[PDB]
């Protein structure tokens with residue numbers, strides 16, 4: 001039987017800094033009785049270290065007579081991963097959507113989940129069930145399978161099953177649906193203004209299908225839905241959205257997680273401590289506070305004070321604790337195993353790598369062409385390769401060794417690969433224009449050129465050179481084509497993963513045919 005402080009602690013999931021458990025992590029577990037830990041890149045160096053860290057955190061909880069921990073992560077696949085060293089880089093959602101095959105979304109998720117569970121991670125903040133029907137969406141993009149409820153539901157429920165079959169709790173996000181937003185809830189408080197009929201047929205549909213089949217957790221969106229909530233409360237803080245729609249109309253009695261409370265949509269308009277209280281009042285079970293210890297303690301203190309002041313009832317707290325304990329039992333989070341990972345070990349296998357390679361071969365999409373495009377192996381090839389230099393958690397600094405140039409080189413092509421910034425410098429732009437005068441076969445890999453004017457201008461400049469045969473292949477959002485009216489040949493790869501660049505190289509050299517279908521619209525749908 002848990003004390004009040006232990007019950008309140010169960011409602012919080014916190015992050016920390018460390019490759020081994022830090023003093024902050026130790027106090028969160030032993031003194032604040034936190035229910036969960038979320039990992040970021042700072043916690044994840046290699047498989048042996050992660051597995052050791054998860055076992056250490058569980059040991060700290062066990063030896064202090066605390067409930068075993070949920071341990072989560074944002075391992076969505078493709079362009080949103082927190083660990084690539086020693087694990088399979090799996091295609092992401094929109095790459096899977098373009099391949100169109102629900103069975104491949106299962107296998108992709110099962111690889112992710114199998115490897116996570118081997119590292120002691122028992123929860124994943126995935127899959128996104130957001131439907132990216134707005135090509136301007138600045139935060140979802142290729143994190144969505146595509147622009148229709150049918151495709152997102154079909155692939156998304158199989159991803160849930162692949163995660164949970166591997167022993168990892170799936171968390172569908174971001175309820176009731178972040179795909180339409182033109183604004184980013186990291187930075188602002190977005191609104192989805194549409195009528196209930198539209199939410200019922202689009203936004204809500206994949207969440208309904210996931211709930212019907214059994215999903216361990218649902219994460220909310222820090223987004224206003226005036227058709228559901230008349231007050232200026234995002235879904236995370238709205239009893240209309242959570243208790244009313246999710247728990248009531250949709251019958252969901254599983255774990256409801258807030259999106260990160262440190263995001264501007266909450267922290268700037270409502271505050272972390274009072275947001276924590278309001279999230280529980282709205283119907284959430286698990287309060288996510290990913291980064292700052294001060295804000296984690298503020299949420300814990302505010303939740304305790306709210307119970308002690310009579311604002312949150314005893315039954316209400318027990319209700320969430322019951323859902324969290326049931327999930328923890330269901331995923332056998334107290335289970336142990338022999339150590340099988342030592343420093344230097346990898347979970348990558350030939351079989352899993354070749355499986356995801358075959359997925360990406362089905363994903364590459366041709367959006368525009370004027371005739372033959374395949375590279376002439378007897379001539380040099382200039383590859384323009386973009387790299388993220390200023391990062392965020394949606395768009396991370398994430399270096400890739402297996403570039404398009406890497407794969408073209410492995411095929412015997414004479415490649416000059418030039419790396420430039422996603423916002424290229426003036427010198428990089430001048431350097432590319434100069435080399436294009438010496439190498440007429442040019443492939444630009446674009447990377448959200450639709451959001452990077454200097455990148456798009458360079459591409460449009462190359463497209464206007466009559467001495468240049470230019471191919472553009474987008475390695476993040478496929479909507480770049482909307483900003484590139486002069487480009488004659490445009491491919492979408494939906495990510496810059498090793499397997500996507502391998503498949504792209506095979507397409508450009510005529511070794512495989514294009515099979516992908518653009519899974520989200522180039523213009524917003526209603």
Ligand SMILES: CC(=O)N[C@@H]1[C@@H](O)[C@H](O)[C@@H](CO)O[C@H]1O
Pocket residue numbers: 074125139173174178185186259260263290393394
């Ligand atoms: C809209 C959005 O991207 N929200 C993300 C969420 O997906 C992620 O699970 C959480 C924890 O890292 O951080 C939020 O910023």
